[PDB]
Design a binder for this molecule. Structure first.
Ligand SMILES: CCNc1cc2oc3c/c(=[NH+]\CC)c(C)cc-3c(-c3ccccc3C(=O)OCC)c2cc1C
Ligand SMILES: c1ccc([P+](c2ccccc2)(c2ccccc2)c2ccccc2)cc1
Length: 165
């Protein structure tokens, strides 16, 4: 599997986080969540705020300590008075394995997520289960077979994996 190693400083993310019981069939809920954010003008409003620290819209999967799973639609923004309407989180600095899913959204993303899932199974000491992972949707036609979604998986100590020696 191909991936790029990337590192991010700590960032401020502005958007809306919803919380789902399962994290399993949440895929249907996540679909509805995207649809609602588009319909209610939230995507458009967040786009205005995107400072380009990351060049697109994020779909973050956030683990909850009670076992629930949250999904946050967000952009990187300047920490400046958006708490009144939006959720604002700090995304703690981390290294990442960054994968590319090429094809029409969401199917290409789902298929790649499955492959990533199977792949990182061999890196249990290096992935970070408590840290958010995310989809990154940069500018483009998400219905195009050429469209690329990035999948960002946080890692620690990856250099020590015996695969790299
Ligand atoms: C700039 C990013 N723009 C978009 C990003 C999106 O990410 C999605 C992630 C998903 N899960 C995690 C992979 C699921 C299930 C649906 C998604 C849709 C989606 C949700 C509801 C209905 C249709 C779509 C959809 O994909 O319509 C075709 C584009 C989606 C749509 C747009 C428009
Ligand atoms: C609990 C919650 C999330 C993960 P995981 C993961 C998958 C495969 C092997 C190890 C870990 C994940 C990844 C993609 C989709 C669903 C779950 C995961 C979480 C954070 C960082 C790396 C991997 C694991 C346990």
């Amino acid at each position: 599997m191909e991936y790029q190693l990337q590192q991010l400083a700590s960032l401020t993310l502005v958007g809306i986080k919803e919380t789902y019981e399962n994290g399993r069939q949440a895929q249907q809920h996540i679909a509805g969540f995207w649809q609602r954010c588009y319909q209610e003008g939230v995507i458009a409003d967040l786009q205005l705020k995107n400072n380009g620290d990351l060049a697109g819209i994020l779909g973050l999967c956030i683990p909850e300590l009670d076992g629930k799973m949250s999904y946050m639609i967000a952009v990187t923004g300047d920490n400046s008075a958006d708490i009144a309407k939006y959720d604002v989180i700090t995304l703690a600095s981390s290294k990442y394995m960054v994968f590319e899913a090429q094809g029409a959204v969401p199917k290409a993303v789902q298929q790649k997520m499955e492959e990533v899932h199977h792949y990182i199974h061999q890196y249990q000491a290096n992935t970070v289960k408590s840290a958010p992972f995310f989809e990154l949707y940069q500018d483009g036609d998400t219905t195009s077979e050429k469209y690329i979604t990035e999948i960002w998986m946080p890692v620690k100590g990856l250099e020590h994996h015996h695969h790299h020696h």
